[PDB]
Design a protein around this nucleic acid. Structure first.
Lengths: 105, 529
RNA sequence: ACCGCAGUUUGGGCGGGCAGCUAAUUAGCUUAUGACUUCUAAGGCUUGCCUAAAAAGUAAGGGGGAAGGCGACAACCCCCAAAGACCAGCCGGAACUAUGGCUGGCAACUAUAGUUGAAACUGUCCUCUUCCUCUUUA
DNA sequence: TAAAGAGGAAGAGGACATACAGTTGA
DNA sequence: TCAACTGTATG
């Protein structure tokens, strides 16, 4: 259900698009990323209709990650219409991410 | 164990040596921290594999159960709303709690790259945007190629000198005893960091030029010499030091104690040596304790040697414990902390606080204001003259800062002494002590209470009562300040500190009484007395 | 009040201690979260005099000499004195008041008899949080 | 009176308080 | 040639 992103389409996809979009910066060879992939998959379904979710592979969109001040993977950016409404770095737990979204929505 | 703190006088050469040693120790602290952070990745990966196994087992046990309850059990964690389930489903909910945090993952195909920590040792880690983790090593020497697996591997002077030469620094002049002491401090800090039962202990911090080590710790042996007739202490790394304390021979009591370890400390008041002393039997006990890993490795925990060692350790520990027990009169007290009085007693005793420390605090505030005004004026003049480089501090400012530091130290020492005296008094007088505090008032008062150090008082009283053979209780605080102690009914207060019982059946009806005394009596009753 | 020194603190001890009132340079009462020296940015009354943030310093047991400091003062020399106040037991529900009383001994001071000689001490490391000062905005 | 920085401290609260081999040097 | 210091092992 989560939308796979790309470098070419990012500007329209994440800025012009209506509503908040939670973009996760993901790389396959990482541990903490594999720890949270299930959690993001779950949240994309639970909050459906209240918050859209998205994924960008830093090995397949290398120029996107540097621009938004992202240094370590994983990273979560809640965008809202042209700007990063919320930012987070770290492999949060389920409760942590849930409270994060509840506070930021 | 006890610590005796003795004031010493150092010569200029000795002070220079002390500064150089502290600089080397700061360098060692930073090196050890860098290595430990570099190494945490392997620990985290092992933990992650174990956690994936645990999630798999929980998933299997949840799925293999009947389909009727498992759906609701899953939704319990998958949905924020949580209804009041039956015991049957609640048991499964608990038995599959690892789903309350995580979900299954492969954890395969990973290259175990070094990880960056955050505010916790396990969750929140990230890998900075390929190279498998590799261990660092001593560049050369007699120990070339040794992998620094743990921090205890850094206890080698030869390798540390190799590293210093690699970084183009002079060789270490600090003895290995102090190196071991610093490594012990770091190990304790890291263990606190990784312990989940602690939620305020976090990653150790790097030390800048303004936060250097201020102590030398020798945790391996007692001082080489303690000459009591001539007032001299010969310790490692220094020439003999002179003692300028008048009661040190009496406090140390070297004819009935046993020196174990020491620390050279620096405070605004001066230079101190802290000697740790214990019971004479202690040296036997440790000799046996350190011997347990041997027999456990040679005969097994089920052998008779292990049982004999345990029996002897228990016997020695019991002798040590009974070496400091005092017979009492069996008097019971209820203690309630107060606002006007530091502690109030079940029989009407209101102890005044340490009112002398408030004046010191006010003095500190005034001096801080004065120093800040002076600094502002100096910076304005420095900028006006036409300089952009950072300013250099003045002599008057240094004097003012020294005064502020000494005042802070004096306040801390005063609070410590007052708490010690009150704890000793309470321990001597009473055998059973019941303690309960109502901090609801917190919901400046914080300024007043930050100076009374109630937690330290309670800790000292608890320790001293336990040593003497007494009993210490912490009953619940439910409905204590607003309950008539002879009736249990909720009364009323006619003043800021007075209380009156309500119902006419009371014996104390319509008789004002101190509220603190009532709280103390309630605490004593709730303690079984 | 406060400051310095006696291991660290409290009650005390020796020394430093603004200003006002009173009495006779030196004694009492009120009272300052230290006192003093040198040179200055500034400010006040009228060209002079006063007060002075900052800066650099001085002393903090008594007395007599004394090289040398712009000055507060003083390296060095001679005499006197020596409080964070003694030891051991036994009572004490030990507060108010930061530990009261009795017994024995030992010191010091008075007139063989009296007074004084108070209490306590387990510190270090770490990570969080709190407090305060000063700034900026509101 | 309120809120956010920077810097100097402390209070909370948990632990901790080494033994043998092998080597050097006055 | 014996005390003091350095290396190893454990928690």
């Amino acid at each position: 259900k989560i939308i796979h992103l790309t470098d070419d389409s990012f500007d329209t996809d994440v800025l012009k698009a209506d509503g908040a979009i939670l973009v996760d910066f993901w790389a396959e060879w990482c541990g903490p990323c594999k720890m949270i992939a299930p959690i993001l998959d779950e949240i994309a379904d639970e909050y459906q209709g209240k918050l859209t979710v998205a994924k960008l592979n830093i090995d397949q969109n290398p120029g996107t990650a540097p621009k938004y001040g992202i240094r370590g993977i994983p990273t979560l950016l809640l965008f809202k219409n042209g700007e990063v409404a919320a930012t987070k770095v770290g492999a949060l737990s389920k409760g942590q991410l849930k409270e994060f979204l509840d506070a930021n929505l | 164990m006890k610590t005796i703190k003795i004031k010493i006088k150092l010569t200029t050469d000795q002070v220079q040596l002390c500064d150089r040693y502290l600089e080397e120790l700061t360098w060692l602290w930073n090196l050890t921290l860098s290595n430990q952070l570099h190494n945490h990745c392997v620990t985290w990966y092992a933990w992650a594999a174990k956690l994936s196994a645990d999630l798999d087992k929980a998933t299997e046990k949840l799925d293999k159960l009947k389909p009727e309850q498992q759906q609701l059990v899953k939704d319990y964690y998958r949905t924020k709303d949580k209804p009041r389930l039956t015991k049957k489903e609640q048991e499964l909910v608990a038995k599959f709690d690892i789903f309350a945090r995580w979900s299954s993952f492969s954890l395969d195909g990973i290259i175990p790259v070094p990880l960056r920590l955050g505010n916790s040792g396990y969750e929140g880690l990230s890998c900075q945007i390929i190279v498998p983790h590799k261990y660092r090593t001593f560049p050369g020497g007699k120990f070339e190629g040794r992998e620094l697996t743990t921090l205890e591997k850094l206890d080698n002077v030869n390798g540390l000198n190799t590293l210093r030469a690699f970084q183009n620094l002079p060789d270490l002049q600090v003895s290995s005893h102090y190196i071991g002491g610093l490594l012990a401090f770091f190990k304790e800090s890291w263990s606190a960091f990784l312990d989940p039962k602690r939620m305020n202990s976090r990653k150790p911090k790097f030390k800048k030029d303004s936060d250097k080590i201020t102590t030398l710790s020798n945790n391996q042996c007692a001082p080489n010499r303690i000459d009591v007739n001539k007032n001299i202490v010969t310790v490692t790394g220094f020439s003999p030091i002179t003692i300028i304390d008048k009661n040190w021979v009496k406090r140390l009591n070297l004819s009935q104690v046993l020196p174990r370890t020491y620390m050279l400390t620096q405070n605004p008041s001066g230079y101190y040596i802290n000697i740790v002393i214990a019971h004479p039997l202690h040296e036997e006990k440790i000799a046996l304790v350190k011997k347990l890993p041997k027999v456990k490795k040679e005969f097994g925990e089920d052998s008779q040697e292990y049982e004999d060692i345990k029996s002897k350790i228990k016997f020695l520990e019991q002798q040590i414990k009974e070496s400091s027990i005092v017979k009492g009169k069996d008097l019971s007290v209820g203690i309630d902390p107060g606002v006007q009085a530091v502690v109030s007693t079940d029989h009407g005793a209101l102890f005044l606080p340490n009112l002398t420390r408030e004046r010191v605090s006010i003095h500190i505030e005034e001096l801080q204001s004065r120093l800040d005004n002076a600094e502002l004026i100096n910076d304005k003049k420095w900028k006006s003259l036409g300089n952009k480089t950072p300013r250099i501090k003045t002599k008057n400012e240094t004097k003012l800062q020294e005064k502020i530091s000494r005042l802070h130290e004096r306040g801390a020492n005063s609070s410590n002494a007052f708490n010690h005296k009150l704890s000793t008094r309470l321990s001597r007088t009473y055998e059973h002590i019941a303690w309960e505090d109502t901090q609801i008032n917190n919901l400046g008062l914080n300024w007043i209470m930050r100076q009374r150090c109630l937690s330290d008082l309670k800790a000292k009283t608890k320790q001293k009562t336990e040593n003497r053979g007494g009993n210490f209780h912490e009953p619940p605080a439910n409905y204590s300040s607003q309950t008539c102690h002879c009736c249990g009914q909720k009364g009323e207060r006619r003043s800021q500190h007075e209380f009156v019982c309500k119902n006419s059946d009371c014996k104390l009806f319509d008789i004002p009484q101190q509220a603190d005394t009532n709280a103390a009596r309630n605490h004593k009753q709730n303690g079984g007395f």
